[PDB]
């Protein structure tokens, strides 16, 4: 008769991390990769012998910065001359070249100099997400929904589809990240009547606020706002500067010029930062940090909160701006949705909850997984081919 159909997948193709889910047995499974990670770094590294993707690429970045590519999403569908591209290039250790006013990343790979379009790098990340899904399902996957920021234009959306096609995926649809997060919570399944939904998306490097109106399952993007210079990495930076000062006071030594020491400090700071989302304090223990000096210290959640206080408060400016643009008052928002790992920060949650006069925040779906979750829900809907009964 008719052979069983393979499940379709939902992929959040993120700037820093990507996530893949599948809707089966009436529920979403967010699929861990073979290192046990439910999210995979959107990184690709090139050596004389290998092309590494995901954790393997991010884990060797320290010594291979010129040939480890990340942030390709910031280049996707953009012109080389775009001022965003020109500014971003100053922060990247890898080379970005101009090919007909289209950016390409240029690396050393398998004995040669090779340049790739951003969609080619993203296709490599998509190939890894497809393989992660296939390792769990135990069969080849063909169909996928891929998400993008609501602000992506036609060129950025087409270049994302192109990345999916290069990876051998059939792209069912390109859907907006805030829309996918709303779908994850079933906010399009509440029946008749308008619902105003605010998506609060705090990433590693950027912050996006979106206001959507949902009416009879139909989504309309009412307003987008944000801060391109606000993310998790800025909180890590504040902790780094704090501990550099602390080492200076305690040992009368400036570590800031030993790249390894600074990197080991940043790595420990990011983990201490995550611990502080669940505990009121966190220890920091680094052996032989600088000149054989062991750095054994601690930081309270209160001190971390004070260190990033202005940054956390600044998340409310794009919220107020988006509300003005949507011509809505805060009480008129029915649902608040958290997206991004940085939203696990209790102080960030409290500031936003206080702004919306004590309202509950939807955070029950892991915020770094909600976009893939919604994309997986939609992918299963899009492949249905029910024929009506008489
Ligand atoms: N529990 C957590 N508490 C605070 N921050 C977190 C957490 N989990 C994740 Br994931 N992050 C941060 O999210 C960003 C994703 O690119 C990075 O800055 C991560 O450090
Ligand atoms: Mg995201």
UniProtKB/Swiss-Prot annotation:
Changing residue 79 to R: Significant loss of acetylation and ATPase activity. Decreased binding to HOPX and HSP90 and increased binding to STUB1 and NAA10. It is found in: Cytoplasm; Nucleus; Cytoplasm, Cytoskeleton, Microtubule organizing center, Centrosome; Secreted. ATP binds at residues 14-17, 73, 204-206, 270-277, 341-344. Residues 4-382 are annotated as: Nucleotide-binding domain (NBD). In response to cellular stress, acetylated at Lys-79 by NA110 and then gradually deacetylated by HDAC4 at later stages. Acetylation enhances its chaperone activity and also determines whether it will function as a chaperone for protein refolding or degradation by controlling its binding to co-chaperones HOPX and STUB1. The acetylated form and the non-acetylated form bind to HOPX and STUB1 respectively. Acetylation also protects cells against various types of cellular stress. The keyword Membrane does not apply. Keywords: Acetylation, ATP-binding, Chaperone, Cytoplasm, Cytoskeleton, Host cell receptor for virus entry, Host-virus interaction, Methylation, Nucleotide-binding, Nucleus, Phosphoprotein, Receptor, Secreted, Stress response. Induction: By heat shock. The modification N-acetylalanine is found at residue 4. One of its GO terms (molecular function) is misfolded protein binding. The modification N6-acetyllysine is found at residues 79, 110, 248, 350. Its main location: cytoplasm. The N-terminal nucleotide binding domain (NBD) (also known as the ATPase domain) is responsible for binding and hydrolyzing ATP. The C-terminal substrate-binding domain (SBD) (also known as peptide-binding domain) binds to the client/substrate proteins. The two domains are allosterically coupled so that, when ATP is bound to the NBD, the SBD binds relatively weakly to clients. When ADP is bound in the NBD, a conformational change enhances the affinity of the SBD for client proteins. Component of the CatSper complex. Identified in a IGF2BP1-dependent mRNP granule complex containing untranslated mRNAs. Interacts with CHCHD3, DNAJC7, IRAK1BP1, PPP5C and TSC2. Interacts with TERT; the interaction occurs in the absence of the RNA component, TERC, and dissociates once the TERT complex has formed. Interacts with TRIM5 (via B30.2/SPRY domain). Interacts with METTL21A. Interacts with DNAAF2. Interacts with PRKN. Interacts with FOXP3. Interacts with NOD2; the interaction enhances NOD2 stability. Interacts with DNAJC9 (via J domain). It is linked to In certain aggressive cases of activated B cell-like diffuse large B-cell lymphoma (ABC-DLBCL), plays a role in the cytoplasmic sequestration of misfolded N-terminal mutated PRDM1 proteins, promotes their association with SYNV1/HRD1 and degradation through the SYNV1-proteasome pathway. HSPA1A inhibition restores PRDM1 nuclear localization and transcriptional activity in lymphoma cell lines and suppresses growth in xenografts. This is Heat shock 70 kDa protein 1A.
